[PDB]
Amino acid sequence: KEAKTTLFCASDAKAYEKKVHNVWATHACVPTDPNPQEMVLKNVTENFNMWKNDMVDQMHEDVISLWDQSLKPCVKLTPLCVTLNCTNATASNSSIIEGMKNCSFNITTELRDKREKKNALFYKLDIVQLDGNSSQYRLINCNTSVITQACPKVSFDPIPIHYCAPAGYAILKCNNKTFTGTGPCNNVSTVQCTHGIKPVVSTQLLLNGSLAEGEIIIRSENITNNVKTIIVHLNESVKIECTRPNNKTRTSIRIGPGQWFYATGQVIGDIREAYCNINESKWNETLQRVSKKLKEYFPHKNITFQPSSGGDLEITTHSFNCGGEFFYCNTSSLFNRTYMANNSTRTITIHCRIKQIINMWQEVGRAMYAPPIAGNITCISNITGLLLTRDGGKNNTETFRPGGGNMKDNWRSELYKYKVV
């Protein structure tokens, strides 16, 4: 019999040898209990509902609370939100004159001098023009929420976290893979702890995900209703590489008592923005299979893909993180295909702007600074799922666009199987 309860978190036998207690907390006292056993059971059928389930809010609340409480003992950045007089008189590259190089401020530093002229390098989207002349600039985030530097001890990777139910409770993941997560399923594989779910945050795409059963599938609410958020899982994993080619200089400006703030020095090497590569043949075959299976859901009219509309930076870009740096890739040309009703060559590339200061989450709360790192950075992963969203017009073309509009749609793609009884 189903009920409402609160679960716990577990981990594997991997432990932090650097002993970063703060992020070690993810597995600091969480028991490893690495004994995953499976069982099979028969005579169970029931209307499963992945949209109205119980533990996705549990996952979202603990992920956001872990991200908030991982930064409390770290340094507070608060005395840096001051006037920024940024000049940009010289130009090693033409795209640097808009509020990037030698952006100087009058800072009272550690040595008790009130007006030291100290400069830094910043990104033009991360800065805003103050209401007046163009000679002064302001940080886009300290207007809204308090900014906080990230410590070196909170350097994060996706740990394949495990959920275990307490005594007197059980969890059921239905074996049927074709199950759309909305309706009567069949014979039940029963475990006490699920397989690993990595807490990766992403928009419009699923990276380092879980593969399918052998062919792609389309899941959502019952077709009887007007489905909007459609999560598409794929059987053919597609490699994605995203890289930045510039070595960077890391400088130290002391603003806290006895601790350090790290800022960006000069760019070393030939300067370009971030760029990502997708194999054209696998992408074309992937979209062909997605269209040819999505046709039987709506077997009357044409379907098409469109890039996302505006409103903020996250919906307009593919947003992810690699190496402690946040990447916003355009991805507009990847969804311009249109279809009709009734193995790696000529690779496609996409631009990708990088970010330093993120608004992060909990606007009743704090916000993040990301310190820079040196060296050319390559980040390779596999894409598994899509987060397209449906709209319908008066014409015979059903439009789709990457989206979803919630982080809970990211967790719900892998947590659809489980409910508590």
Epitope: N225, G392, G405
Partner: antibody, heavy 122, light 107 residues
Framework: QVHLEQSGAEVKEPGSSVRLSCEAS????????IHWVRQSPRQGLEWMGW????????HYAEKFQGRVAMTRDRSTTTAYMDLSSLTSEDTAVYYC???????????????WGQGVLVTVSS | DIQMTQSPSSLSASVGDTVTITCRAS??????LSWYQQKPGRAPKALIY???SLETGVPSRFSGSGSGTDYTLTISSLQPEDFATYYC?????????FGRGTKVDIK
């Protein structure tokens, strides 16, 4: 126990804009959508548009494209609407709407606010 | 665009009897339909949705039926605070469109 609250309004001039604000309480604000509707004599209940409160993406009406602007604010949990370039037919009462089936299949909206008159005069 | 028509704006009724109200659509709106009960001076509330399933707190006096391009609502043994106007709204697709509304009045 979900509640929508919006305040009063006063007279504005044609060719100008108007500011409308609504706030939500009871249920978590980031999990459904916010709709805007309009009531007036001699007209029906014309649809204005809908807004995702978590993200910035919106959807508009083809009759009212360019004359309206939308804004979410998750800090104060508010929805902001800006009708611009007023015309004498727009003297009407305006209503907010909380939708259901959040991030699923949006079907019918139930929770409505008080609704506020706005009148344009030169 | 999707255009609806309804019954004429005035329906004769008496307390504790049956009232049949209907509205017709022009295209395929499947069962994506809902109704609202508009009282003057007050923001209306949904009472029936998807032509079959009622909302909690709303009694069994309002029975919805129909399919395709015409939909009916039957009111059996009505009480005096159902003497207000009724609107029918489709939610098939596109920008939405509302009905014109019919009032329930005593002869």
């Amino acid at each position: 126990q979900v509640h929508l609250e919006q305040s009063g309004a006063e007279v504005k001039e044609p060719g100008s804009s108007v500011r409308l604000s609504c706030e939500a309480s009871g249920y978590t604000f980031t999990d459904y959508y916010i709709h805007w509707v309009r009531q007036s004599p001699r007209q029906g209940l014309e649809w204005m548009g809908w807004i995702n409160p978590y993200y910035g993406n919106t959807h508009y009406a083809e009759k009212f494209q360019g004359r309206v602007a939308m804004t979410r604010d998750r800090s104060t949990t508010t929805a902001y609407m800006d009708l611009s370039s007023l015309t004498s037919e727009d003297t009407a009462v305006y209503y907010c709407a909380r939708d259901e089936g959040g991030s699923g299949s949006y079907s019918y909206f139930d929770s409505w606010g008080q609704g506020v008159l706005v009148t344009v005069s030169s | 665009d999707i255009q609806m028509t309804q019954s004429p704006s005035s329906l004769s009724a008496s307390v504790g009897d049956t009232v049949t109200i209907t509205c017709r659509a022009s295209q395929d709106i499947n069962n994506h339909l809902s109704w609202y009960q508009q009282k003057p001076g007050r923001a209306p509330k949904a009472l029936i949705y998807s032509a079959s399933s009622l909302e909690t707190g709303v009694p069994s006096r309002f029975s919805g039926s129909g399919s395709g391009t015409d939909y009916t609502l039957t009111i059996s043994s009505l009480q005096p605070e159902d003497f207000a106007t009724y609107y029918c709204q489709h939610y098939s697709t596109s920008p939405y469109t509302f009905g014109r509304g019919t009032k329930v009045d005593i002869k």
